[PDB]
Each structure stands twice: as structure tokens, then as C-alpha cells.
Design a protein around this ligand. Structure first.
Ligand code: NA
Ligand code: NA
Ligand code: NA
Ligand code: NA
Ligand code: NA
Ligand code: NA
Ligand code: NA
Ligand code: NA
Ligand code: NA
Ligand code: NA
Ligand code: NA
Ligand code: NA
Ligand code: NA
Ligand code: NA
Ligand code: NA
Ligand code: NA
Ligand code: NA
Ligand code: NA
Ligand code: NA
Ligand code: NA
Ligand code: NA
Ligand code: NA
Ligand code: NA
Ligand code: NA
Ligand code: NA
Ligand code: NA
Ligand code: NA
Ligand code: NA
Ligand code: NA
Ligand code: NA
Ligand code: NA
Ligand code: NA
Ligand code: NA
Ligand code: NA
Ligand code: NA
Ligand code: NA
Ligand code: NA
Ligand code: NA
Ligand code: NA
Ligand code: NA
Ligand code: NA
Ligand code: NA
Ligand code: NA
Ligand code: NA
Ligand code: NA
Ligand code: NA
Ligand code: NA
Ligand code: NA
Ligand code: NA
Ligand code: NA
Ligand code: NA
Ligand code: NA
Ligand code: NA
Ligand code: NA
Ligand code: NA
Ligand code: NA
Ligand code: NA
Ligand code: NA
Ligand code: NA
Ligand code: NA
Lengths: 421, 421
């Protein structure tokens, strides 16, 4: 069954179409139809100083194709056009065969910072020689994850220079379906005294890192020029401009910020829907954006001229969860996971990066388009009118004729000012 | 009237205390008491493909003192302990005289990227010589903001190198109480054809930038060591460790990400409550964090040893709004603004940066503390037991005695293993 007309349908009609798609159980469908919310009682358990609840829209982005599997994606966003743009981008990319994705690795990194280490290199060697015993100790500290098949997998020690110098111990941990904050903090507390003794130093802190480089996930898409525009060579032109737009975000931090913001319009929307911590994902991705010594766009758009295809690619750290308090307690979060077919965290991560790339595609395409609203046509024609050499009284008649045309440039405004005078 | 006991009070009791504080009008108080939400109808106007609404907790952070003015701050967060930590940090800092804040500048930056410019330097000069006429054209394009006292204030042109090179025109615009996306996009559309003609180039895009460096706002606080701990020299020790924690986030991107994440736990919470676009604020701040060629902590904690004070400081781009669709349409957003005394955007911005710094303070203080939960005490005592040289059977008795003590290190575990053997 088709999703055609979903945006223009009324609220009630959208629910009927969704029901026809048979994506939700009878319980979840009824929960959605009475727009069941997280209660004050539940809110009061989740947070502190609770005096009520706060609501945002909840929307669907249909036809998200990821590794040959189609998803209907839930969005929570208060920004006009974000859902419409994601849905549009998703249709185009589905027609083009959808996204291809890979999880490079899925582990969490935690760190212990040591200071007042007289001999950092000797401390480094000592700790590294005790690697196996330290990992065992970390694993005994949180046995439930070992039983599930996860646990501490690696440990390394680095000298970080500054004022002062720090000796930093990093642990790499398979947290399975959890984000793993509590797990990592617990393992690090256990290691603290041993690491202090081995380094003859003082522990400053033991904490998870939100720079989740053991959780990188890449999405890509491959879009034939003909899907960008049906017109003869207009598709190639759009593709070129998107690639230039991509190059511009690599060059200018002022563009990069906006480029990456647009990606997170979509990413944060699905993160909220699925009960995931968006501050953690924002921080890791924006740090990742800076890795080459400049703040840069998180995605890349290039041309394959031989195959006549526009190629999009994006790698992000995506340590999302399918187990957590919000997932357990917010009835709409539980619904969002069911809606998606209850993906694993790895699967969810691949969907989310794809969503970001779709969102990026729509923003870039709209940004490089030359067909714009009537209000801005009257405005651009006014600029060309004045640029042609028009006086005060000559502006209004010149605009009327310019807007009557399908397309127009300076030479057209000069031609029309010539005839008028 | 005191806020003492606010966290431990029931939901109903918190509402009664709030009512006693007389911060809300009769209408706003009643709206809150029936936990009035943004409706599906309103959600459907805000977003697309709407099939319902999504709820999050709504909390209060009392006693936020900013430039001698006390605020009760609204938070929307699903993360346990974030509100409690902000409230705790806020009490301490209020006792210490609160935050001191300044708005450096409040303007929005928009950009037009030009390519295929044969002579970039001649184009640069030509455009710069037409500066006044270009600003006038931008201002005629959006006359309502000029009437309110805002408008385009400056324009400059830069050569940005890459593959290929871009000639970039930046406009600086006073958008008053608005974020100014529509305003800036409209002014840039008007300038596009003129800039193309002056540069003999092609316009790639005309768009607002979320790297809001014409919107920097700094907060600082100054906390006597005695407020950190009542114990003799323990306050100094805590202050030292916080400053080291701050130095660590300057040195290690893995720490920086987490440091800045913790700041945004608070910032995004108040942004949501006040109907502000958190993706825009996240992007700008995380880009700002990278400005010196490394991704670094957004705040600084230093010691004034002579005055015996811990000093916190943070500068962020904070182009928030007090006019916008969410502010107009979400009944709880309107409530949040009333609750705050209807601050101007500049005033709101100063509150938000202060909130971030408070949130940071609480995270750092907790991170460097050595008094932790019983579960982790049994865990740390086990590590010291094994480290002392205990065998399998010797662990359990050694832990029992170590946890009976108030404080313990390796020498204590060695002493107790000596007595046992
Ligand atoms: Na809901
Ligand atoms: Na509560
Ligand atoms: Na609401
Ligand atoms: Na798709
Ligand atoms: Na696919
Ligand atoms: Na689905
Ligand atoms: Na939405
Ligand atoms: Na939307
Ligand atoms: Na993991
Ligand atoms: Na991590
Ligand atoms: Na990681
Ligand atoms: Na890594
Ligand atoms: Na990885
Ligand atoms: Na991953
Ligand atoms: Na692909
Ligand atoms: Na771009
Ligand atoms: Na984008
Ligand atoms: Na946007
Ligand atoms: Na969430
Ligand atoms: Na959530
Ligand atoms: Na963040
Ligand atoms: Na991330
Ligand atoms: Na992350
Ligand atoms: Na890019
Ligand atoms: Na993942
Ligand atoms: Na939630
Ligand atoms: Na449900
Ligand atoms: Na529900
Ligand atoms: Na799931
Ligand atoms: Na978009
Ligand atoms: Na509400
Ligand atoms: Na809608
Ligand atoms: Na909800
Ligand atoms: Na305060
Ligand atoms: Na103050
Ligand atoms: Na207030
Ligand atoms: Na909250
Ligand atoms: Na909280
Ligand atoms: Na402004
Ligand atoms: Na800006
Ligand atoms: Na700005
Ligand atoms: Na600036
Ligand atoms: Na500024
Ligand atoms: Na500002
Ligand atoms: Na201060
Ligand atoms: Na830190
Ligand atoms: Na922090
Ligand atoms: Na956190
Ligand atoms: Na918002
Ligand atoms: Na909002
Ligand atoms: Na963002
Ligand atoms: Na910002
Ligand atoms: Na910004
Ligand atoms: Na710092
Ligand atoms: Na501001
Ligand atoms: Na809202
Ligand atoms: Na209200
Ligand atoms: Na309300
Ligand atoms: Na206000
Ligand atoms: Na905090």
C-alpha cells in the first residue's frame, strides 16, 4: 500500500493509513490513537523537581530504505519542513536503491586521568604489562554484561601533554544494547586504586567518553542524475552544485556548522523518538567533525561522471541504545522501537546515520535550487531592475514584466528597461 | 519563601510551593496544574506527517542568580540527576553571589558563496566599494525589522581557499528578538543577483550561518573555597581538582566531548522549555569549541589562591529568540517565558550560558569527589585487597573490615591482611 498523499491527509486519515500499513500491534495502534503520553508520575520517576510534562510533535518519515530493508521512521521535531524534507529525501534515495551502511565497531570508551606521575613512561609500561589482569578486574566488577556476551575488551595508556601532563588510561568496552555509562563508571571505579598504585600517581576522574570513536557507522547513497531532475541536463547541474556545497562545508567553518546542524535536525528527531541521549550524539559527532584540525562538514557529496550518479557518504560515532530508562518508561518511545521492527542498537545506528544523510541531501538540494517563492521573485527582479539602471518610477513596471517571464537575468531587465525608455 | 525540600516534596506539593512563590499569573498557574500540553492540532500546524505528540518531563531549577537578578529556570530533560545537579550547582553559586554576565554582541551572520570568479581580489574590492548600497538593498528587502530598529549592519567579503576556491560574502544583521533565519535568507536572495554581477561569478547558495560569532555571551562565577566544603582544607582540594579537570578538557578531545556534553544537558533543557532551536545552539558552540585547531572544553575553571576562590568562565554563541512559532504555539513554552519574567533574548542568553556553567560545575565537582556509593566501596576495597596480596578466600573478610572504616587505602588493606595472616 502506497504512502502517496500522506502529508496532505488529515491527522485522522494519517492514522487510518498507518493502520492499513499494519506496522503496529493492536495495543500500540490504540496507544497512538488516544495519543498516550508519558504521565506526570513517570516523568517524576525520570527527572527531579518535576512540576509537569512538555510535549512536542510526533511524525513519520516513510520509505527509509537501509541495506534493502524498508523502515517507517519516527521523528520528534518542532521545526517546520524538517519532516517534509526528510520524507522527500527518503523517497528519492529509495528510488535510487536506498542506503548502504556498515558498523565499523561498537564499543564504548571510558577513561581514567592520572596526574602527579613522576615517571610516565615507566608507569605506561607497568600498566600495559598488567593489561590482562586489569581487564579481568573490570569484568568482575560488572558480571552481568559478561554473561550477556559483552565486557571490557581492551585497555591502553597514553601520555597527554599540557599544563600539567596527564597519564590517561582508556578502556574499550562491549556494552551490547546499552549506552553503558553506569557500566563504564563502575568498571573505572574498580580500576582506579590499582592504576594509582601502578603509576604511583593520583586519579583525577574515571568517566565514560562521549567521543565515541569505537562506535563509527557509515552510510552512503548513490543517486542517478535523472532522479535529481527529469529535465535533460538539469540533473547533472543539481548534482554539481550539491558537490560544490559539500566542498564549501569542508572549507568554511561558518558553512560547516549550518551543514552539520541540518544533519542533526533529523538525527535528534529520531533520537528523541527512540529515547536516546541526543546531547551525547551531538557532542561526539561535532568533535569528530573537528578531527583534522578544522571544524568541517560531516558528510561528503561527490560525482561519478562515468555512471552519472551523485554519491553521498557520512561516518558518525553512533553509540545508541535499545535498553534504557526512557525506552522502558516513555510509552511512545516503546512504540517507536516496535514501529521500527525492534532493531538492535547496531541496526538502529545504521538507520540514524542514513536519516542524517537523507536530511543533509534535502537541505543541500533546496539550497542550490533556483526555483523559489513568488515573494523572492518580486525581490530578485527588483534587484536586477535597479542594477539595469532603473530610477524610482521605473522599478514597478519593470518588475511586473520580469515576473511574467518564466526565467530572467540582468540582460532581460536591461532589454525591458530599453523598451520602456 | 524558601525552596528547601522542593525535590523531596510530592508533585502536588511542588505545585503548591510554586504557587506560594507567586511567579505565575492565575491563568498560567491553572494551565500548569492541569498539565496543559501542546495539542495534536497545534503539533499538526508546526510539523508535517503528524500522527500525535511526544512528552518529556518539565522541571524547575530554582535560585539561578544572574547579575543580581534571581530566576526560577524551567528544564525539559529525560536524564536522571540533571535537574538535581543544576539545582545544587545553582544554590552554591547563589551563595557565592551568583553569575556575572555580558553580551558582547547580538547579530546574526548570513553568507553567500560565489564560485567561478576569475578575479577574486577585483571582485572583493568591487563588492566592498558597494557596501552601503548592498546594505540598503538588504534592508529594503525586509523593512519590518528596520522599523523595529534592526536590519543589516555590515558586510564583508573573504577569499576562502579549497577545491575549488570560493568568494564568500558575509552579512551581519540585527534581528532583534528573532533568530532571523527567514529574515537573513530573504535579504540574501535580494543580494544574490547583484553579488553575481559585481563578482562576475555564480552564486552557490545564500543562507544563515549557525556559527554565531556575532552572538557571543560570557558567564562567570566566583566561589569561595568554604562553599565547596566546610572541612578545613578540603575546599581548596576540591577547587584544585576542578581546575585540573578543566585543564584536562583542554588537553584531551575524549574528555572535551564529555565536558561539553554535560554543559548541554542543561543548555538544551532550557532551550526546549523556551521553544528555542537547540540544534543551532549545539552546532555553533561545538564549532566554537574547535576554534584554536583542537576540539576543547567550552569552559575554564581557575584558582585565585590569594582570594581563595574558584573561578568559572564560559563564552558561547547564544543567538536565542523570544519570538518564534514554538514560542507562539506551545502553551508550556509561553509559560516558561512568563516564568522567567519575559526576558529579552539578550537576557535569556545570559541566563542560558549561566545555566551551562552551573551544570558544568556540578558535573566537575561530582567527578572529582572521593565519597561514593556503598556498591563502589565494596568494589574498591576488593581491588585494594587483591592488590595487597590476598588469595580467593581472603577477599571477603578483608573487604568487611575495610568498609567498616571511614576511609582506606592500600596500606590499610596491607595492614589488615597482615593481621589476618
Ligand atoms: Na507520547
Ligand atoms: Na521529580
Ligand atoms: Na507542551
Ligand atoms: Na530511503
Ligand atoms: Na538499501
Ligand atoms: Na518500520
Ligand atoms: Na515531528
Ligand atoms: Na517538521
Ligand atoms: Na557497545
Ligand atoms: Na564512547
Ligand atoms: Na566508543
Ligand atoms: Na577508537
Ligand atoms: Na569505530
Ligand atoms: Na556503532
Ligand atoms: Na551507496
Ligand atoms: Na554545505
Ligand atoms: Na545539512
Ligand atoms: Na534548519
Ligand atoms: Na531522548
Ligand atoms: Na526521549
Ligand atoms: Na552536546
Ligand atoms: Na556521537
Ligand atoms: Na557519542
Ligand atoms: Na562536507
Ligand atoms: Na552502534
Ligand atoms: Na523520553
Ligand atoms: Na505505546
Ligand atoms: Na503512546
Ligand atoms: Na529496538
Ligand atoms: Na533538511
Ligand atoms: Na506542556
Ligand atoms: Na502535519
Ligand atoms: Na510521550
Ligand atoms: Na545561582
Ligand atoms: Na549575580
Ligand atoms: Na523567574
Ligand atoms: Na526535566
Ligand atoms: Na533530571
Ligand atoms: Na540579532
Ligand atoms: Na549567526
Ligand atoms: Na552571529
Ligand atoms: Na564575528
Ligand atoms: Na560576538
Ligand atoms: Na548574544
Ligand atoms: Na563572576
Ligand atoms: Na573536564
Ligand atoms: Na560538564
Ligand atoms: Na551526562
Ligand atoms: Na525547541
Ligand atoms: Na520547544
Ligand atoms: Na547540531
Ligand atoms: Na551557538
Ligand atoms: Na548558533
Ligand atoms: Na576546559
Ligand atoms: Na543573544
Ligand atoms: Na515546542
Ligand atoms: Na500556558
Ligand atoms: Na501549559
Ligand atoms: Na521572553
Ligand atoms: Na551536571
Amino acid at each position: 500500500i502506497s504512502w502517496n498523499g500522506f502529508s496532505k491527509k488529515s491527522y485522522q486519515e494519517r492514522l487510518e493509513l498507518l493502520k492499513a500499513q499494519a506496522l503496529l500491534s493492536p495495543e500500540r495502534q490504540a496507544s497512538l490513537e488516544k495519543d498516550e503520553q508519558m504521565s506526570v508520575t513517570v516523568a517524576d520517576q525520570l527527572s527531579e523537581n518535576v512540576v509537569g510534562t512538555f510535549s512536542l510533535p510526533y511524525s513519520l518519515v516513510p520509505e527509509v530504505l537501509v541495506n534493502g530493508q524498508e523502515y517507517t521512521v519516527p521523528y520528534v521535531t518542532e521545526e517546520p519542513s524538517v519532516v517534509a524534507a526528510a520524507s522527500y529525501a527518503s523517497k528519492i534515495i529509495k528510488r535510487a536503491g536506498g542506503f548502504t551502511t556498515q558498523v565499523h565497531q561498537r564499543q564504548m570508551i571510558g577513561q581514567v586521568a592520572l596526574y602527579q606521575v613522576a615517571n610516565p613512561k615507566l608507569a605506561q609500561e607497568k600498566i600495559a604489562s598488567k593489561k590482562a589482569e586489569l581487564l579481568e578486574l573490570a569484568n568482575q566488577a560488572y558480571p552481568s554484561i559478561v554473561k550477556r556476551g559483552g565486557g571490557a575488551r581492551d585497555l591502553h595508556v597514553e601520555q597527554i601533554k599540557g599544563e600539567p601532563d596527564f597519564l590517561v588510561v582508556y578502556i574499550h568496552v562491549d556494552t551490547q544494547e546499552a549506552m553503558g555509562a553506569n557500566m563504564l563508571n563502575t568498571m573505572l571505579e574498580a580500576l582506579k586504586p590499582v592504576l594509582e598504585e601502578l603509576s604511583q600517581g593520583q586519579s583525577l576522574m574515571g568517566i565514560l567518553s562521549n567521543y565515541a570513536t569505537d562506535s563509527l557507522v557509515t552510510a552512503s547513497c548513490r543517486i542517478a542524475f535523472r532522479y535529481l531532475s527529469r529535465q535533460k541536463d538539469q540533473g547533472r547541474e543539481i548534482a554539481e552544485k550539491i558537490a560544490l556545497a559539500s566542498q564549501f562545508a569542508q572549507a568554511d567553518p561558518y558553512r560547516a556548522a549550518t551543514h552539520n546542524k541540518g544533519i542533526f535536525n533529523g538525527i535528534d528527531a529520531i533520537l528523541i523518538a527512540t529515547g536516546n541521549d541526543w546531547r551525547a550524539i551531538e557532542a561526539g559527532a561535532h568533535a569528530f567533525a573537528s578531527r583534522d584540525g578544522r571544524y568541517q562538514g560531516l558528510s561528503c557529496w561527490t560525482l561519478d561522471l562515468e555512471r552519472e550518479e551523485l554519491v553521498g557518504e557520512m561516518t558518525l560515532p553512533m553509540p545508541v541504545a535499545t535498553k534504557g530508562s526512557s525506552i522502558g518508561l516513555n510509552p511512545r518511545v516503546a512504540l517507536s522501537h516496535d514501529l521500527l521492527g525492534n532493531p538492535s542498537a547496531r541496526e538502529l545506528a545504521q538507520i540514524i546515520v542514513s536519516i542524517g544523510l537523507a536530511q543533509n541531501f534535502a537541505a543541500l538540494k533546496a539550497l542550490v535550487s533556483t526555483g523559489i517563492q513568488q515573494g523572492h521573485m518580486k525581490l530578485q527582479a527588483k534587484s536586477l531592475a535597479l542594477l539595469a539602471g532603473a530610477s524610482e518610477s521605473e522599478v514597478a513596471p519593470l518588475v511586473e514584466r520580469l515576473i511574467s517571464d518564466k526565467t530572467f537575468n540582468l540582460e532581460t531587465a536591461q532589454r525591458y528597461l530599453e523598451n520602456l525608455r
